[model samples]
Target chain A: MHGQVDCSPGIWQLDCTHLEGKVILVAVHVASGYIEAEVIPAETGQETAYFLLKLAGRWPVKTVHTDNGSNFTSTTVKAACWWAGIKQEFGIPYNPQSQGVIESMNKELKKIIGQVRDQAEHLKTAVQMAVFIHNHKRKGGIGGYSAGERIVDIIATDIQ
Target chain B: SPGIWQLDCTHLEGKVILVAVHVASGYIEAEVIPAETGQETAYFLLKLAGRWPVKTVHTDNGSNFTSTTVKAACWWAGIKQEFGIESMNKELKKIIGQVRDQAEHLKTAVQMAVFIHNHKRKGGIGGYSAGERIVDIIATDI
Candidate 1:
């Protein structure tokens, strides 16, 4: 049985931005190189708590990494992670490379977005197209396989 | 009138307008304004460094471009200034009107011009962009 404990290098990246005056929380699963989920107008810790709790049902995240910002240091977040039994990790102040994979992912996502938005108005469609192309389309890195495909293969090979 | 036409739209919140020209090649940089301010334009120029060499700039009788402050900046940057002639203004106005009509709105028109000027080749000069033109100049220099 390949339990959650068997997965290596499984960490999630969490970032927040004040878009149009509302705080937007962006999270991505680095091992999969896919967006784990998103939250907007993140208040206290309740939203973070609920989101983490929900994600636990789907994927086994070993550790969560985030920039040490105010929105992250809250009681509800700690309680939710405690219930989910996942360790929390915080990067040094302003040190972006702590989660280098997701940082690179963020740049790729933004570049794809600039390309698509010039042609299309629908933001969701642009994001969906980018994710779809990234997952299936082979590129130079990861031995010519996408992050999504790589994740499954890595897990499968680890068992044998 | 052949230079950077700086239009005065500072009174309006959330509007950016500038008339850009290709330096080495006398092509329009395309009509673009910031969705906010000209900070994007400044950053865009920085992005164009090592990409383009601007020799001459043209402008219409817009207050923003004519201002002593702006003229000083252009002078310091080594761009020759050309004022818009009345005849050319009428011609450019006609073309701008047609572009606005095709775009269905001014904002989309700017976006269309930006896409084309940066990506597509020009019909008249067989050139691409100021940045690319500058690169070609360096290539020939070497």
Candidate 2:
């Protein structure tokens, strides 16, 4: 059901935290288990929405399915999704379970990466490598083929 | 290093910069991208081709330069993609790190990074700058 078909309601599960002195935003495809842990400058509405805009840029995510944290509840965030044609969907009212998928993703990242995630330069590298590790290296949580490898087949081609 | 061009994308703050390196001549072309999709990447290739010349295209195994969409883009553009696709990403990152400290904005930093690399990194068995080396190709290849 992959191979980039409008994500067909692909879930953009994301959450942010201050990891090692930098703001870390961890987003997962839930379906692919392919993750993206990025370092944003701040959690402001403008900055928050800017990150998702770039997110939608790379892959056409169908829905922004995140918890209704302050970052996810802003007008700018809603505006950004609306502008990009991505539906912004938060968890059910008073729900504490909707973020379980991404919570585990965040936990694993912070549990590992003993190295510091600092500044735009250092934090970004660690975040990207963290993504690659979760995508290409780790397997059990994603269960076989790793997260990246799960979607790897959809990445090949031919031309003459 | 003859005509092999390597394509890679770099992330800076909230921006994505697509880079194309002329392996043979050591020339580099990079610019900030709004999207990192295959379509945008193919569009990036067009920018690189117009600025320089691209006969063969190389990139990372799994990247925005995905074979599914990017391959077709290359075929129509008379380009080829392979391991020859991604090189100098780590090397480029190093330069970006240096530039990030000097510039105020992500776009400025990447522009500075590419500028410094093409202007400083030596080629011709470590003689001419990457910028200088490309002239020999573009100046004469045309």
Model 1 docking grade: incorrect
Top-scoring candidate (lDDT): 2
Listed in order, each prediction's TM-score against the native is 0.42, 0.43
lDDT per residue, candidate 1, A65-157, as tens digits?
764454565778877788888787754112123324555555666666566666656565555566565566666665677666776675467
True contacts kept of 1: 0.00
> Which residue pairs show backbone clashes in model 2?
B1-B24, B58-B84, B58-B85, B59-B85, B59-B86
Query: What's the CA error at residue A59 for candidate 1, in Å?
Result: 1.2
lDDT by residue for model 2 (A45-113), tens? 787788888878876677866655567778999999999898876541111333256766777777555
Record all residue pairs in model 1 with backbone atoms less than 3 Å apart, i.e. clashing: B1-B83, B1-B84, B1-B85, B2-B58, B3-B57, B3-B58, B3-B59, B4-B58, B16-B33, B16-B34
TM-score of chain A of each: 0.70, 0.74
